[PDB]
Amino acid sequence: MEAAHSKSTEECLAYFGVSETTGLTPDQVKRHLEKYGHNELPAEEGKSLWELVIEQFEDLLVRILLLAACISFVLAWFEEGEETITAFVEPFVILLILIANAIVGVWQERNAENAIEALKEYEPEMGKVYRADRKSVQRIKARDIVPGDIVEVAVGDKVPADIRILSIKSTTLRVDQSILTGESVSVIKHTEPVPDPRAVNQDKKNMLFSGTNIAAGKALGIVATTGVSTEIGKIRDQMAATEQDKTPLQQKLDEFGEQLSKVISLICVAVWLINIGHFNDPVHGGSWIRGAIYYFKIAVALAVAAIPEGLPAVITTCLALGTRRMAKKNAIVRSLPSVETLGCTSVICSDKTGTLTTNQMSVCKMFIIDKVDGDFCSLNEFSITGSTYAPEGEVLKNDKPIRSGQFDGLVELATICALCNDSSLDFNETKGVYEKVGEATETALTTLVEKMNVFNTEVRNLSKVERANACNSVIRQLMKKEFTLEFSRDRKSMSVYCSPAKSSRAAVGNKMFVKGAPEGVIDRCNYVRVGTTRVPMTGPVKEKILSVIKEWGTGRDTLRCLALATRDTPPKREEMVLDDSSRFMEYETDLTFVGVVGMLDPPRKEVMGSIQLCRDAGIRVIMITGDNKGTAIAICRRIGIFGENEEVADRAYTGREFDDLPLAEQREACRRACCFARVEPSHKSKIVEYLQSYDEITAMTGDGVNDAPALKKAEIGIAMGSGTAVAKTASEMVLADDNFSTIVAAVEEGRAIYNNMKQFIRYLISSNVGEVVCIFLTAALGLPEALIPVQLLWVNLVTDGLPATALGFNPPDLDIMDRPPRSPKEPLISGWLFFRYMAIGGYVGAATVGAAAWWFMYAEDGPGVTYHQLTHFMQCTEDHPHFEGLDCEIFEAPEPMTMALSVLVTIEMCNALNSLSENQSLMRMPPWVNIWLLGSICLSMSLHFLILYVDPLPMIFKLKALDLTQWLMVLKISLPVIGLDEILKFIARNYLEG
Ligand SMILES: C/C=C/C/C(C)=C\[C@H]1C/C=C/C=C/C[C@H](C)/C=C(\C)[C@@H](OC)C/C=C/[C@@H](O[C@@H]2O[C@H](CO)[C@@H](O)[C@H](OC)[C@H]2O)CC(=O)O1
Ligand code: NA
């Protein structure tokens, strides 16, 4: 029964066919349980296993690198040399990274909590039911409960299923629907049906939702829906169906992997096409097995050279170090990738109360009728000082302090604010200030009564605690609070029936003090108070009332007006039906207007600049609020979303308006709307869908379970620190101080990280491009091997990894918030940037190959050899006469490879300094700016010397120590890379920037 709220209690019993006295018979229990199933959310199966590891080896590059290990393992065993430990190193280190890199991607254990599992914390273990097999109540497992069950609930009990209330045994039934609404105010429930079939959960005043817990009272009802059919269940299915996309950066890296695979695959074919001349060679010239060793040992080098093996470790360390910066700036980021995509935030949908405002409600102004006479009419405006819940303030008229007690209208003003009020004040000694108890709205009225002091009570003699509820208690001495008519969205008001104490205070029997929305209350007023006297509600007077209320709400004050009226001749205690919530409005009729009070929910102290900060950053800010369209717009103009004097008729909508628009115009409205008032529960996720349709990175925010689906669907889900756990687990970010400013502050960090992140990405890729050119040059020309795959890995992992990680601490390029958001489909390298690192990669390739060729030919300690015979090193044993000087092992010498490797390492240290800034010259930007970079460079070169000195290492890397004689040549060939890059930077700023 999904529409059980609209059906009467007799109808729900008739549908399921169950007796309220007996309950479901064990036969029915078997039938209902086998039909509707168990009352429990589906166990989130489809979890990770060994398959999660398989997913890491699904891409193309990972298979190419894996293939490099298999081919390497084949060539590892096949060798004549009697070397032991160095045998299984090439295929060993590959698995080390392939395993390590896979573990990083599989790392979704500690860096990501489950949202649906946190949602299962609301469904209780056991629940009470009345079955036909027994007489007394019997508690069973909540899962065993089925639709049609006659369940029982009391105070403290957690509601097991969506229950249609049948009978309330206690005096009044209160439930804390904080998770399914947000307001901590325990709403009062009733038994009568709600006529609207598609009414919102907040309107269903005869339903107990699962997950909710009874704050007070005891009642019995029939179970309407269970499992996924409940309100919690329907929210769960929305989250389960919602698929989260991957950050635009992640899509670029997956895209780069596909491109890099074609590059490796193309070069492998290119290398084979260059050696197509071997077709025109004798079969007795040698063995094909010797040529196959070259083809296989080359391909493995290509895979290792092209791939940036250290990249994943570099970003994981950077983003982890970026997470700590987020936490310090009040921003608990969930996942690692979230810190980067945060900078690409183009839209920020935020809630007004709590986030944009301080939630420190306080009455600022208030007016009453001065006197009425024909067409003439005059009011009596006042102003209250002290934007806080503390009574430390005063009342003044026209910027002059006055005694509130001297106005009879103000006396009843404070009377209604004190009586018609369930909240109160409470002084906290630990904090050292006055705290609120209940609603922010009602507590402000409590504070107002304390400031006014209409009956002139002693205040200086009182203590700090007695001062809390002094004036309010004095009011309670006069009138007795008989009963209160609960607040409802149908009439938008609240009244309280009151009887005078035994003292004869000139009271006309009993009274009703109304409090609620202006337009609703003023219309039901047929009379108007004038201090002590009363006059009929005339036209001219009603104009002045709504005009001032219009001025306060629409004006710069942006006040939440609240009309206060009183019923002088209310119906008798017997005639009033206390259970019928619909008749409450009729009871609140024929009222006498007393006065209006205007309160303000003060905007955040820093939102003025944060909003303006988004204006420059090109980020669109949309406000979601519960205020009316008129005031919501006025508030938007105040904080900065709107200008003080611009047109915003189509740039702002209500829940009613937006819902009435067609599907096409709803999407058209979301691309220009910057304010949504009176928003429906499901409208949050709708707006996200329309925003996502324009390929726009959205940042929706919430706090309760209602917003979970919207947060889950949004790219950047934002939750509050004071929000529920489900909102936190579903969101990508959690605001520590619940501030809109900390969102923008985090977004600014997101762009700063992405700039530094994108920088070392081009740095590593630049090195990988050079390693491919080094291999292709030494292979195509037919030269001896310049670099070994075991060497290239240690270069990408350590020597390039350390500085690349140190590049994450690069100084933030100022004026970053001046530029617009990073485009989702923006390439990492393109145009001039591609040519820039292409030339840099092109030079290092020739430098490393030339460095090795230097030792083979024009060397000091090396042999005096020429180029034409150096390319024919594979024919050393064959063509004996042409090659004669020393052993053939000299072609496979460690010296020339040490030169090629030293030149590669030295240049990357210089290229790391080139990566300090993208275009800013090293003359402008000092190389010693980033201290962590210099520390990493010193550590890298220290490790470079380590693999040459400490004997155990160089034997494995196939290297031999170089003296000062050989190191000089390395610096001569390496250092020129800075000058070349300096020229490219100079060309970029001059003949490009325009
Ligand atoms: C981009 C932000 C990601 C967050 C993060 C915490 C970790 C990321 C950092 C990403 C590095 C990418 C490098 C590209 C390069 C060509 C590939 C190599 C060296 C690869 O080695 C050949 C290593 C890849 C390891 C990472 O693998 C993940 O594999 C998944 C399945 O295909 C993809 O969905 C992820 O796409 C972004 C991808 O990152 C381990 C990992 O999670 O690392
Ligand atoms: Na999400």
Curated annotation (Swiss-Prot):
Compartments, record wording: Endoplasmic reticulum membrane; Sarcoplasmic reticulum membrane
TM annotation in the entry: 49-69, 90-110, 254-273, 296-313, 758-777, 788-808, 829-851, 898-917, 931-949, 965-985
Binding site for Mg(2+): 351, 353, 703
UniProt key word NADP: no
Tissue: Skeletal muscle (at protein level). Skeletal muscle, fast twitch muscle (type II) fibers.
Ribosomal protein among keywords: no
Residues that, per the record, bind ATP: 353, 442, 489, 515, 560, 625-627, 678, 684, 706
Location of the region described as Interaction with PLN in the Swiss-Prot/TrEMBL record: 788-808, 932-943
Cofactor(s), names only, from the UniProt record: Mg(2+)
Domain of life: Eukaryota
SMART domains listed in its UniProt record: Cation_ATPase_N
Protein family membership: Belongs to the cation transport ATPase (P-type) (TC 3.A.3) family. Type IIA subfamily.
Protein name: Sarcoplasmic/endoplasmic reticulum calcium ATPase 1
Organism: Oryctolagus cuniculus
Gene name, Swiss-Prot/TrEMBL: ATP2A1
